[PDB]
RNA sequence: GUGCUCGCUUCGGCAGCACAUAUACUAAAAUUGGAACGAUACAGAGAAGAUUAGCAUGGCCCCUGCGCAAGGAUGACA
């Protein structure tokens, strides 16, 4: 997942650098929000897979079409 | 029942004494009931997909027609 993470980190770093180039969000709210988003998307990737049901065999046993 | 008491008493007998101490589904007999996957009778392919014919829909690519929206380039003297 490291390249998928690197793309996201690069995008959010571009956003933070554009934020900082005008010296706005001096205290650091935007960076904290972007880091929180990055961490949440990282946890989503590593979140354990959902519970998935087993499909039983249908039945051991009707008209059919015909054309081109 | 056997044997014995110095007993009564006679060998005909009697009274007492030691040993014997608790088997058995008990059973010979009573009766009326319910009963095959054994035979004959029938069936017996005792293991298969339980199908294949059209048309329309759905996907992709052109072509043509009509409509809607937004446009491009061009043409016309008396």
Swiss-Prot record:
Enumerate the residues marked as the site Interaction with U4atac snRNA. Answer: 3
Interaction with U4 snRNA and U4atac snRNA (site feature) positions: 7, 12
PTM remark: Phosphorylated by PRP4K during spliceosome assembly.
Give the UniProt tissue specificity note. Answer: Ubiquitously expressed.
Enumerate the residue ranges of region (Disordered).
48-68
Q: Where are the transmembrane segments?
A: none
Localisation:
Nucleus; Nucleus speckle; Nucleus, Cajal body
The lineage's top-level taxon is Eukaryota
Family statement drawn from the similarity comment of this UniProt entry: Belongs to the PRP31 family.
- What's the stated role of this polypeptide? Involved in pre-mRNA splicing as component of the spliceosome. Required for the assembly of the U4/U5/U6 tri-snRNP complex, one of the building blocks of the spliceosome.
Per UniProt, subunit arrangement is: Identified in the spliceosome B complex. Component of the U4/U6-U5 tri-snRNP complex composed of the U4, U6 and U5 snRNAs and at least PRPF3, PRPF4, PRPF6, PRPF8, PRPF31, SNRNP200, TXNL4A, SNRNP40, DDX23, CD2BP2, PPIH, SNU13, EFTUD2, SART1 and USP39. Interacts with a complex formed by SNU13 and U4 snRNA, but not with SNU13 or U4 snRNA alone. The complex formed by SNU13 and PRPF31 also binds U4atac snRNA, a characteristic component of specific, less abundant spliceosomal complexes. Interacts with PRPF6/U5 snRNP-associated 102 kDa protein.
Task: Read off the domain note.
Answer: Interacts with the snRNP via the Nop domain.
Disease named in the record:
Retinitis pigmentosa 11: A retinal dystrophy belonging to the group of pigmentary retinopathies. Retinitis pigmentosa is characterized by retinal pigment deposits visible on fundus examination and primary loss of rod photoreceptor cells followed by secondary loss of cone photoreceptors. Patients typically have night vision blindness and loss of midperipheral visual field. As their condition progresses, they lose their far peripheral visual field and eventually central vision as well.
Q: What is this protein called?
A: U4/U6 small nuclear ribonucleoprotein Prp31
């Amino acid at each position: 997942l490291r390249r998928k993470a690197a793309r996201l980190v690069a995008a959010k770093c571009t956003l933070a650098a554009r934020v900082d180039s005008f010296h706005e969000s001096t205290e650091g709210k935007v960076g904290y929000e972007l880091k929180d988003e990055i961490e949440r998307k990282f946890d989503k990737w590593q979140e354990p897979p959902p519970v998935k049901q087993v499909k039983p065999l249908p039945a051991p046993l009707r008209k059919k079409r015909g054309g081109r």
